[PDB]
Amino acid sequence: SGWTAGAAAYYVGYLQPRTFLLKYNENGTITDAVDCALDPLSETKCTLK
Amino acid sequence: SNLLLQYGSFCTQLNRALTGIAVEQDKNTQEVFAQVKQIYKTPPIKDFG
Ligand SMILES: *[C@@H]1O[C@H](CO)[C@@H](O)[C@H](O)[C@H]1NC(C)=O
Side-chain half-sphere of B16: how many Cα atoms within 13 Å? 8
DSSP assigned state of A43: H
Q: Which of A40, A19, A43 is nearest to B2 (CA)?
A: A19
Instruction: Please tell me the distance in Å from A46's CA to the nearest CA on chain B.
Output: 10
Which strand (E) or helix (H) includes residue A30?
Answer: strand A30-35
Q: With contact defined as beta carbons under 8 Å apart, do A24 and A30 qualify?
A: yes
Length of chain B: 49
Ligand 1 atom closest to residue A29's alpha carbon, by position in its atom list? 14
Elucidation technique: cryo-EM
Give the three-class secondary structure for A35.
strand
Q: How far is CA A49 from CA A13, B15, B16, B19, in A?
A: 27, 12, 12, 15
